[PDB]
Symmetry: C3
Subunit: 230 residues, 3 copies
Amino acid sequence: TGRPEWIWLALGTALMGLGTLYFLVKGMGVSDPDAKKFYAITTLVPAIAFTMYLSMLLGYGLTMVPFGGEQNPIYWARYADWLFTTPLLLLDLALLVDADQGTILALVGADGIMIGTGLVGALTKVYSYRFVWWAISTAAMLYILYVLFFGFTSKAESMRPEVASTFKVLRNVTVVLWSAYPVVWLIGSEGAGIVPLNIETLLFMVLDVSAKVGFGLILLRSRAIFGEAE
Amino acid sequence: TGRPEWIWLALGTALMGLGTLYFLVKGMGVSDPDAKKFYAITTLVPAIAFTMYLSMLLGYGLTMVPFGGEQNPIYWARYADWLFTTPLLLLDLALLVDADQGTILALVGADGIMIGTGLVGALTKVYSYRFVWWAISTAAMLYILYVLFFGFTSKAESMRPEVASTFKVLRNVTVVLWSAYPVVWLIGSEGAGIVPLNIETLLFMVLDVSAKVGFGLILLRSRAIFGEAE
Amino acid sequence: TGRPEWIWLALGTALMGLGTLYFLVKGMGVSDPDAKKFYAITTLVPAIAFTMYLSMLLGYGLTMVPFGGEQNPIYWARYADWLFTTPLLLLDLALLVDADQGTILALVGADGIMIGTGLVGALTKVYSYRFVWWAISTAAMLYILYVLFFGFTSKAESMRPEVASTFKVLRNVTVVLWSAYPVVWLIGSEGAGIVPLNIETLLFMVLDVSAKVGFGLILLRSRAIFGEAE
Ligand SMILES: CC(C)CCC[C@@H](C)CCC[C@H](C)CCC[C@H](C)CCO[C@H](CO)COCC[C@H](C)CCC[C@@H](C)CCC[C@@H](C)CCCC(C)C
Ligand SMILES: CC(C)CCC[C@@H](C)CCC[C@H](C)CCC[C@H](C)CCO[C@H](CO)COCC[C@H](C)CCC[C@@H](C)CCC[C@@H](C)CCCC(C)C
Ligand SMILES: CC(C)CCC[C@@H](C)CCC[C@H](C)CCC[C@H](C)CCO[C@H](CO)COCC[C@H](C)CCC[C@@H](C)CCC[C@@H](C)CCCC(C)C
Ligand SMILES: *C\C=C(C)/C=C/C=C(C)/C=C/C1=C(C)CCCC1(C)C
Ligand SMILES: *C\C=C(C)/C=C/C=C(C)/C=C/C1=C(C)CCCC1(C)C
Ligand SMILES: *C\C=C(C)/C=C/C=C(C)/C=C/C1=C(C)CCCC1(C)C
């Protein structure tokens, strides 16, 4: 409790933990192989996020980075989380639309570049260079958002109506929430330092819970996750 | 030789090295694509374990973690090994029974959470919190063991008799040997410190060789790894 | 500019950056799913290499390792690059010949062992032991080259002529360029220290650009990357 951001970390932990348990319970019983894929991916996302929120809460996922003449507290565990959870979120979207394997590789690959360069920016000791990594990461993000809107063209023809409507809602959720992440980082403790760490942590907790648990609720309540069957 | 556990590390290295070479030689010649998968996975497991045993032997895979007021020697390389070898062992089991892809994702994902939280517990400097990570890791392990017993139901109907009988033996080996790992960690150098590092290393070497080389011998001697063919 | 090797790092960065943009532009428009796979993989390789060249250029990807009584500047970011880019290059080759999944696992697995042991050797503080890791890594490399020449036998029968001819050229490029890497490391700053870091960096930049951008140009200009279609 010695760090004012503790409360949001605690709340993040709880909410990811409850979402994990809810999805685990919800997917008990499902037999449809397509649904099984979506439950697995979607349950793992908040399970991973639970562990990394806990790690931040306990202090393990925090480090001090010198830059601007100071020791800046940097929560590195967020990158360990997103390294796995963001390709998993993309896979859910990808599977929904039956994406080509080349498209899934491009998405997962650009996403790893996004998170890996954000991690490098987060740990960089030359203040100005932190923003170069931020720009490159942001370019990888723009690429991903591009592909999510303009890369699933040949799939329109043969998309069930429910699949298309759940994909569009999840795609919109994804595009609005993920785009806030470079902005928060840029104004927050990792960037310009205009928004204090405690508010930054609040923002990230609200975005993370929405993009993971919120996203998963929408998905796992849709019939789009089942094969079409009599 | 300055650390009494050196001998078990040396023996571990040798045994993983010999098992690797045996499996490499044994799979030379195989053409059946299904068998090829099982040889690959099964040869990589002890090859990876060889490198990480060597790293412990040479001192590279050892670190000192402060906790309980002391510098505790923690072999971190075990987590680098298991991070890859335990999903590979699970994949062998998964492929045997033709598991659904959602099931394989759940297994590999829970296994990464098991090893990643064990690594966090192993490196945590607040003694009491080490056991929180141990509990979470152990919960992920229980999940995996659950899935291995109750998640391959729809597959019974259409399982060749030899596949079912090799899977059950390998599943039993897996469940008994993997369950010892949280116990050894808990009583050993990473946990309560009741069993000294040198005996802890002996235990881990005996379990690892059995679960990897022992497991692989059973598997690679079965006809369950070949497609059914005239 | 304080390190004489800066210029090759800068040039490496530029060339990987331009190759990335060229391949991105070149693959815009492609619809053939098989081609899409090859573009994705092949565009990601220099994109990843761009980020890690930049990281070396900026100083983030450099560390000092004590050995031989000295602080040796070791560029660790090369291993972060190759950890992903070399399995991706192998996948391009693998997909060309429609390799069995067991073969792809063996290749990707041996490649991870190659890079992971090279990383361990690069960071090892006992000078003599660095070369043990070099030998093990080199053995994994020889295995890969073996598989690339003698592991795609059953595939000859049913290989389009263009696929076979592009695969052979790319396989030859791969075998000559990758084999230089253990030699450069062995004589360079990570090994015997016979070739200074600045020339070592030049060598690695010339090899990397050739094996990634050079390789990708050959591939992406071939018709072997398209499904056979009327
Ligand atoms: C958020 C992100 C940026 C992360 C993206 C990926 C990322 C984790 C990249 C990592 C590369 C790298 C470790 C960088 C090192 C930085 C540093 C200064 C040093 C590290 O940190 C330390 C310092 O003490 C130890 O590293 C050396 C040991 C290794 C970390 C582990 C070695 C593993 C291998 C030798 C065994 C072989 C593994 C494979 C066979 C796996 C293949 C899968 C298959 C079987 C299917
Ligand atoms: C046993 C376990 C817990 C491990 C489970 C996974 C684990 C390795 C998670 C790692 C996340 C993370 C690095 C945590 C950092 C902790 C620390 C304090 C800092 C690190 O350690 C150091 C400190 O000096 C360096 O890190 C920063 C650089 C990176 C490690 C590497 C960057 C890679 C990228 C920028 C390039 C893009 C890669 C992708 C394109 C890959 C996608 C595959 C595709 C092409 C198919
Ligand atoms: C070039 C190479 C050698 C690299 C090859 C692979 C390599 C990166 C191996 C890494 C293992 C390991 C971290 C070694 C540690 C060395 C060191 C001394 C300590 C580390 O470095 C630091 C020190 O401060 C932090 O580590 C601990 C935290 C972890 C790094 C991250 C934890 C992740 C998890 C707890 C969450 C679960 C993840 C999975 C669910 C992913 C599964 C995918 C799925 C969902 C499909
Ligand atoms: C799991 C929850 C979400 C939505 C995760 C998203 C992570 C990103 C979209 C990260 C983006 C970054 C960019 C684009 C620029 C650098 C800093 C980040 C790594 C935060
Ligand atoms: C390769 C050999 C085997 C059987 C590896 C197994 C590793 C585990 C089952 C690890 C389990 C752990 C748990 C469940 C609790 C924390 C400590 C561990 C990481 C050792
Ligand atoms: C991306 C460009 C290329 C060709 C990368 C290749 C990397 C290798 C072939 C690395 C080999 C190593 C060996 C075999 C021995 C130890 C040192 C290395 C890691 C450099």
